[PDB]
Design a protein around this ligand. Structure first.
Ligand SMILES: *[C@@H]1O[C@H](CO)[C@@H](O[C@@H]2O[C@H](CO)[C@@H](O)[C@H](O)[C@H]2NC(C)=O)[C@H](O)[C@H]1NC(C)=O
Ligand SMILES: *[C@@H]1O[C@H](CO)[C@@H](O)[C@H](O)[C@H]1NC(C)=O
Ligand SMILES: *[C@@H]1O[C@H](CO)[C@@H](O)[C@H](O)[C@H]1NC(C)=O
Lengths: 13, 180, 190
């Protein structure tokens, strides 16, 4: 079974 | 709470080092070898039960790198303050002469996550059989790390773990030798 | 190397209570050690933790798709991953090896410290007690505390300061989730 990642989010430039 | 699982990531400039790992209750489940793009399970048995697509970690680290750029600017380029490590040396098990054991060097409560660690036997660097963990996250957002040296205890050998960190004025040596 | 360093951290945290009956998800962003913005599943939106995080909280909260992803995380991320790893983490049980040996508080003196070395156990929760001829000794007890070995095992040393008398039997007793009854190790003077 596969562990799922949580994405990291691009901040405001 | 009964348990906590954390996916912890960092990116550090100017070193351009980025790490990705999962932690369960303070122990590492796995990390991703970024250069090899491979999932490294902390205990080999873990990988028989579960999988992780290492490629996904690379994308997160890229975002973290771009975010670091942004946050560095927002802070007016305020750099990190070095926090030097606390270092302890201990054995895995009670020591008996010529019964195989393992020295553990525990390096704790430090940042940034960059350290040089050397095992010394009778004042000389030793590397045969040594191993180490990646940088592990603390709840105070500093780091910890473990280094290991399998050895055969004797009255003739002394050991030191030597730790270099930018927060230290000189390297820190923690000693071990056979008691009594 | 005196060049200034700059560090970004992200911690995506899943907190579990009573199995997966109650779950809390925290999405946390840090600059050096300073948390600047977080999504808490108790709230359901990002909130700035410091002024540094205000622009991101507003920007991220404007993304309905992102917010719905995060609101579902307790299920699609936390509960999912718990299911994947529980068999070798949550259910991991390794019983302690217990050794008792005498030591000295000062080199010149007779053996006056009994060490109960408890090694290799998992998880961390453990109770270690000393007994002298069947009576618990709560005075003169000092310990390393709980030591993580970094390899999914723990150890602890629990020392009893005592002057052993001929005939006395000391017992170190260990309770741990891996055990169904206390593990005891005796030491006799001499
Ligand atoms: C760990 O040791 C390495 C040496 O291999 C250090 O890297 C060098 O540091 C010196 C001192 O500023 C620089 O002049 C060199 O350019 C660095 N690189 C190399 C390849 O020598 C490193 O700084 C040490 N890290 C810590 C945390 O002490
Ligand atoms: C950076 O400098 C600007 C301009 O003075 C200021 O508005 C801002 O608060 C500063 N940021 C930090 C983190 O000190
Ligand atoms: C824990 O979960 C079970 C269901 O699996 C439930 O019956 C029990 O009431 C829960 N414990 C508490 C303290 O609510």
């Amino acid at each position: 079974s596969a562990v799922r990642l949580r994405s990291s989010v691009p901040g405001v430039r | 709470e009964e348990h906590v699982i954390i996916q912890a990531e960092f990116y550090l400039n100017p070193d351009q080092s980025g790490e990705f790992m999962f932690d369960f209750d303070g122990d590492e489940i796995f990390h991703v070898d970024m250069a090899k793009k491979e999932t490294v399970w902390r205990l080999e048995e873990f990988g028989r039960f579960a999988s992780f697509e290492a490629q996904g970690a690379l994308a997160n680290i890229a975002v973290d790198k771009a975010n670091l750029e942004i946050m560095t600017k927002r802070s007016n380029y305020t750099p990190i303050t070095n926090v030097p490590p606390e270092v302890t040396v201990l054995t895995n098990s009670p020591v008996e002469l010529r019964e195989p054991n393992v020295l553990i060097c525990f390096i704790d409560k430090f940042t940034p996550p960059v350290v040089n660690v050397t095992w010394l036997r009778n004042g000389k660097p030793v590397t045969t059989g040594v191993s180490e963990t990646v940088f592990l996250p603390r709840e105070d957002h500093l780091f910890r790390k473990f280094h290991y040296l399998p050895f055969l205890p004797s009255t003739e050998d002394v050991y030191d773990c030597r730790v270099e960190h930018w927060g230290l004025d000189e390297p820190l040596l923690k000693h071990w030798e056979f008691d009594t | 190397d005196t060049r200034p360093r700059f560090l970004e951290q992200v911690k995506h945290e899943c907190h579990f209570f009573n199995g997966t009956e109650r779950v809390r998800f925290l999405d946390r962003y840090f600059y050096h050690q300073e948390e600047y913005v977080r999504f808490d599943s108790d709230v359901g939106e990002y909130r700035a933790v410091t002024e540094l995080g205000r622009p991101d909280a507003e920007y991220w909260n404007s993304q309905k798709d992102l917010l719905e992803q995060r609101r579902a995380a307790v299920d699609t991320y936390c509960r999912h991953n718990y299911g994947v790893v529980e068999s070798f983490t949550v259910q991991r049980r390794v019983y302690p090896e217990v050794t008792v040996y005498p030591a000295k508080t000062q080199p010149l003196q007779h053996h006056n410290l009994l060490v109960c070395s408890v090694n290799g156990f998992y998880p961390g929760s453990i109770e270690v007690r000393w007994f002298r001829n069947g009576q618990e000794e709560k005075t003169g007890v000092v310990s390393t505390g709980l030591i993580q070995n970094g390899d999914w095992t723990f150890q602890t040393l629990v020392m009893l300061e005592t002057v052993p008398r001929s005939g006395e039997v000391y017992t170190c007793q260990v309770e741990h989730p891996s055990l169904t009854s206390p593990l005891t190790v005796e030491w006799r003077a001499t």
